[PDB]
Design a protein around this ligand. Sequence first.
Ligand code: WT1
Lengths: 278, 282
Amino acid sequence: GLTEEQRMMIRELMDAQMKTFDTTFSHFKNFRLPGVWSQVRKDLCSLKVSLQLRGEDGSVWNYKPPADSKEIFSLLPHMADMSTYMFKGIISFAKVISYFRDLPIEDQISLLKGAAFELCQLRFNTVFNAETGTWECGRLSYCLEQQLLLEPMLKFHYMLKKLQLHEEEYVLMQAISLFSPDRPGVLQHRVVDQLQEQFAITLKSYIECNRPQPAHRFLFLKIMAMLTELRSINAQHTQRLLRIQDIHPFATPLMQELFGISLTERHKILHRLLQEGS
Amino acid sequence: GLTEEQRMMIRELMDAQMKTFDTTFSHFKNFRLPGVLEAAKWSQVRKDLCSLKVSLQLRGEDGSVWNYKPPADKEIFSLLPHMADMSTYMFKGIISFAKVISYFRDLPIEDQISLLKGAAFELCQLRFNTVFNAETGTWECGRLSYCLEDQQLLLEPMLKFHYMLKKLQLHEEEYVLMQAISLFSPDRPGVLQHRVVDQLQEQFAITLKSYIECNRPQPAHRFLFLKIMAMLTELRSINAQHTQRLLRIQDIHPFATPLMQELFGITSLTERHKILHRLLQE
Ligand SMILES: CCC[C@H](CC)Oc1ccc(C(C)(C)C)cc1NC(=O)c1nnn(-c2cc(OC)c(OC)cc2OC)c1C
């Protein structure tokens, strides 16, 4: 049994997730596609994937990427368009949350700047297939091509998928990650921290009310440990992606705002999206 | 051996084939691709498209491979715009091939149109056979490949034609001689100079027959010429079948390029074939 606010808190996060997560990716359209230095290449080989695109008629386009030999940056324009679409649903997810919109406009930008990558990877894990190693995104599919676990990103997705979390546990991780008080640029550190502690208490209470099996022992502490690991991966890959942008500019205008390439003035797209409605 | 006129007859056909056959399909660009998105009229159309089912493969300069798996069953009309662009590109190379031949230029412009109107499909299949892989079942057109999908395929005469013709393992000179015999068919609709085209076709047949006698062993290729003539006869029937299959599909779903509309009878001999007439002047 959870308190009435804990029940209300989960139902709002669940309602916000349903309204702002295009799990079928049907509204993802107008995306770039592949046409018909030593420190950089070591990272891209781990996340090498093949792109599949199913059609409403039943046809299947399949893209096998070129081998290792300006060929490792062919999928990045598409992945930038995909990451931007995912984050636009993340922004809408934050706007629906009542505790988020009541924050100052600068804190809303600072929180989304620090949780952009983390909240996308949590939503990506829900469409990740453990056996096939494929992120099934409705019309689109991303299939990979023992040693991969050395890459923290792939290792994070396999460990998180192994926990077999509920929808409520996924959206609570998004709330705990979004309401991080120690993000760069946050002013209301104390108010955001108070909000984060309530999401953690709600997550801890939910697990005790629905997970009696021994496979889920210490599950709350595992989740909190995964959120810390995901925070480190965020710092690694955000620093890594700036090197690729430095050599081959590929980021969309919204991704450029999130990287640093007044807050409301240099984050014009993010400011406009926070003022717009559903 | 071969007579000096027959030797020069092969040299001209080989020269015409070399100048007009983009064997690597390097100049085939700007083509359409399948996008990322009464009752007896359709019933007869579905039977035609399910016969030949191929998957499209696109190799890239960097090493990437785009692959298109066709759908099942207005969904079976996804590959037609691409094949219309491929056929038109092949037709233009066939027209240029005939224009290089001196025996073809001396014919009236109407007989040139009539011969090209009846042998356009046949000469493309002969060129397509040279890039067909019997083992993999794929037409390798350089960066483009067309792999078939399921004796299940021998039922269609078109696929059976390519496998039987490939088994003969014909030379380049024998292939280009088949094109001349097929191009100079005197019994095409609209042909006027029946005797010239018939005598010209007989000389190409004699040259092809004499070429086999002088460049092949004695007992092994004793009937190779008659096998070739049988394949040309079978190929003429496939042309009549395919031409009728395309008119039914075009009537329901227009996909024909302007050049294909003229060669197939869709809307004087030069009044209804203005595009084909212009390509013969230049
Ligand atoms: C389902 C597709 C995804 C998949 C899920 C983990 O994974 C990838 C797999 C392969 C590749 C290759 C290009 C190497 C082939 C990439 C990814 N993955 C990504 O391309 C990516 N995933 N997240 N982000 C990202 C997003 C952000 O917010 C918009 C952000 O903040 C601005 C920073 C980000 O990166 C540090 C990217 C660029």
